């Protein structure tokens, strides 16, 4: 994603409980222990992107370097709107079966999900999302993977 500055707000943005002003300097491989950036692994065969671990952005809703756990259904769709801030709209299509006439018809639903600054999402791309706790009035899913373009 494209973010001009990291600290551009009224308050000071920082990861909670990550102490940053220590007199003695100790170098450790652990992410959060030494005083450097913290991140975790979601699981279910989902790999942490390189941009997340080495980035400087601060986000409390990203599945990586954030305070949200992913559990529940996993869905797929195509993005139709990317005109908000850190939020996208995906379109899901399926076929409903009418028993009397012994044939199907087309139907669709619209879904809202949160997109992290780690990914770069454009219109007309396929994404994979995972369920999380309610983050807003109509946001209950989080972007996990961006499929390659044709």
């Amino acid at each position: 994603a494209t973010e001009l500055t990291v600290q551009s707000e009224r308050a000071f943005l920082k990861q909670p409980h990550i102490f940053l002003n220590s007199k003695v300097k100790v170098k450790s491989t652990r992410p959060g222990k030494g005083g450097r950036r913290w991140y975790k692994d979601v699981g279910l065969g989902f790999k942490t992107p390189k941009t997340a671990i080495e980035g400087h952005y601060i986000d409390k809703k990203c599945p990586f370097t954030g305070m949200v756990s992913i559990r529940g259904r996993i869905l797929t769709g195509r993005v139709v709107s990317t005109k908000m801030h850190r939020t996208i709209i995906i379109r899901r299509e399926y076929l409903h079966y009418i028993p009397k006439y012994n044939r199907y018809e087309k139907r669709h639903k619209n879904l809202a999900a949160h997109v992290s600054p780690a990914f770069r999402v454009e219109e007309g791309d396929m994404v994979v999302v995972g369920q999380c706790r309610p983050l807003s009035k109509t946001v209950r899913f989080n972007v996990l993977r961006v499929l390659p373009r044709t």
Binding site: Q7, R10, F12, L20, N21, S22, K23, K137, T138
Partner: protein, 201 residues
């Protein structure tokens, strides 16, 4: 009374919902309590399940912890100086979470003098009004103290200037309306530079 349900709202398509049921015992809300700086005054409230919460109406002191050194001392709050959300919070001297305040620096300076055998932030040498020396009742203490001073290090100039005046910047990290206590930490480092630049410009 006050309710926090989503029934009265409007659906994401813009449709207007219809009446469903009367207000419930749960989903209620309560009147906010605006903490102020003054003599201590706290009310008790009986919450869900028989538990209790603590409404703080007026407070003047609370715990504040020094990060690098690792000491926690109780001291008083002088006034509120900044609030990222609303300016009217600052003017009223009403304190909530993430409110920048000024605290008395006396307890923290005294601990530094005992732990390290060096003076911290003393430009009264021009006046020398309160200069005093007490005989040290040992000589291994200098061996112990000089080891600490040479090992841990020295305070940065930014935090030292505040010690001369006797006032220190801190951020409330508790929720006074919920727990009835105002607690926080001394802010320092790059976080100090963010607020100082914003505070006077």
């Amino acid at each position: 009374g006050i309710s926090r349900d989503s029934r009265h709202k409007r659906s994401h398509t813009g449709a207007k919902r219809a009446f469903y049921r009367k207000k419930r015992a749960f989903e209620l809300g309560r009147q906010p309590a605006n903490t102020r700086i003054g003599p201590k005054r706290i009310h008790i409230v009986r919450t869900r399940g028989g538990n209790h919460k603590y409404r703080a109406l007026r407070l003047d002191s609370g715990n504040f912890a020094w990060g690098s050194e690792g000491c926690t001392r109780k001291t008083r709050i002088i006034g509120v100086v900044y609030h990222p959300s609303n300016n009217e919070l600052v003017r009223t001297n009403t304190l909530t979470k993430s409110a920048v305040v000024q605290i008395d620096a006396a307890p923290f300076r005294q601990w530094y003098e005992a732990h390290y055998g060096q003076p911290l932030g003393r430009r009264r040498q021009q006046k020398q009004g309160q200069v005093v020396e007490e005989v040290k009742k040992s000589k291994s203490v200098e061996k112990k103290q000089a080891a600490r001073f040479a090992a841990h290090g020295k305070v940065d100039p930014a935090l030292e200037k505040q010690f001369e005046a006797g006032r220190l910047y801190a951020i409330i990290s508790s929720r006074p309306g919920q727990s009835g206590r105002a607690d926080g930490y001394i802010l320092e480092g790059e976080e100090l530079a963010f607020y100082q630049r914003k505070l006077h410009k």
